[PDB]
From a paper:
The MF2 domain adopts a canonical MyTH4-FERM supramodule, with limited flexibility between the MyTH4 and FERM domains; while the FERM domain consists of three globular subdomains or ‘lobes’, similar to previously described MF structures. This limited conformational pliability upon cargo binding indicates that the groove of a particular FERM domain defines its cargo recognition. The five linkers in the FERM lobes dictate the orientation of each lobe and thus define the shape and, as a result, the specificity of the central groove. The distinct orientation of the FERM lobes in Myo7b MF1 and MF2 domains readily explains their specific recognition of different targets within their FERM core elements (reviewed in27).
Harmonin plays a pivotal role due to its ability to interact with cadherin as well as all other components of the complex. The results presented here reveal nearly identical interactions between members of the Myo7/harmonin-a/SANS:ANKS4B tripartite complexes that link cadherins to the actin-rich core in stereocilia and microvilli. Both Myo7a and Myo7b MF2 domains bind to harmonin-a PDZ3c with similar affinities via a novel mode.
Numbering used by the authors: 1 to 10, 1605 to 1625, 1627 to 1875, 1881 to 2068, 2075 to 2099
Write the structure that this text describes.
Amino acid sequence: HHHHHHSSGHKEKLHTLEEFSYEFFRAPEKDVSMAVLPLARARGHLWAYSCEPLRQPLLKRVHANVDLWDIACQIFVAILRYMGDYPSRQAWPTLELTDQIFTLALQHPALQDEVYCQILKQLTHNSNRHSEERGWQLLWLCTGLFPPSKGLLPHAQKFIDTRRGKLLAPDCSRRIQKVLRTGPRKQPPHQVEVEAAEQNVSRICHKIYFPNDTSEMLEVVANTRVRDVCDSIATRLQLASWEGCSLFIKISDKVISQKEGDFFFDSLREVSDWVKKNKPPVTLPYQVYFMRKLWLNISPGKDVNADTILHYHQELPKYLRGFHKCSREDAIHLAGLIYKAQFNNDRSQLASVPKILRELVPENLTRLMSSEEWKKSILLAYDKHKDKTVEEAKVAFLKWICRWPTFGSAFFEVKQTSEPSYPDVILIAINRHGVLLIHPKTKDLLTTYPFTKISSWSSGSTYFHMALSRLLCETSLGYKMDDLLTSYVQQLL
């Protein structure tokens, strides 16, 4: 009957775990005594608020396993510390408390009811308004991670239903409904989740960055999946489709892609834990980016919004690094389009702005003409776009380069030791055609390894290898290559 909303018309007695305890809680410790030993006071109910730490698990099923006793007791202390009912001279960071409360319960589903019972116990006959407020914050965190069992659920629902007047109570009840639909979380609450709980705020917005130097605030809940955020981003930006687009975490010297069917807050913690371990207590700053990952079946003009927000600002810095094989004539034609996309009608910035040529011409082709020469040729190419919009210019830029073999690729400047036929330092490109090998001086295609022909690939922190002929690369970017190759290979319908 959790699928039901119950009513009587009036306020019912506040529901406790007293009746539940009689069957599922273990025997309460009643009272050999010595007059020298201290009294050891506060002999209240086991199912009601106690400022005294536990010594045995509350539940029979957790008490029946001696290995679970230590975890149960450590959970209760972190519960006490969190709620401000413990002598805490040592001010523990709230995340160390919340990790200690929920981490092992995600691992051992026996502890899941134990966590619920300990929070509900602490919310029963609690005369402290600070502690009660904090207790509701933990229950709120809990309902977003795992639900109570079949036997516990009716009691937990009635506990919330008889206290509907509590600020976070309607949300706790709604959250139990959601975690039953979408399943439990893999990670304990995140920094963001915990900071919103602490402020008694039940709505979270996370900032997402776009390649066009913009950002949006996206609404996220405990059960939000990485794909759900993309669906929201695609509605926001008005993209026809986000197929081939993914979210990325820019953290440390890494740009790590997020798995679509992973919970957003699970994905955040998993990546940070990976990064934290691969670097040798303070939290790691990060940015969340939405970008195109796989450039398969991209047709400029079909989705103008994706073209002007994503594709242009993604292709632009690659072209400027001079990764493509292009002429002085292509550079003049494209620099006029790049000028129009950025300055629109302001014609004077080409003379005014110093080092502007860096923003308009590939770094390799810069030496072909003098400063005044590029300026003269670019103005003439630009004047041809007076009746175009900034958006038209961005789509024209793309239409002209979209058929290029190196268009929509990820570039890696590795050190190869495999074939002495090729130069020492080489440029690798992963795109729709496969793994492309390019000469850095003359941008000629050395070889193309299609996906159908690749057998295996491995990467460490110091390298990347491939097999068919065997390719050896010395790079720190191995993780991104490994990931992009696996992702491209995995595209099968």
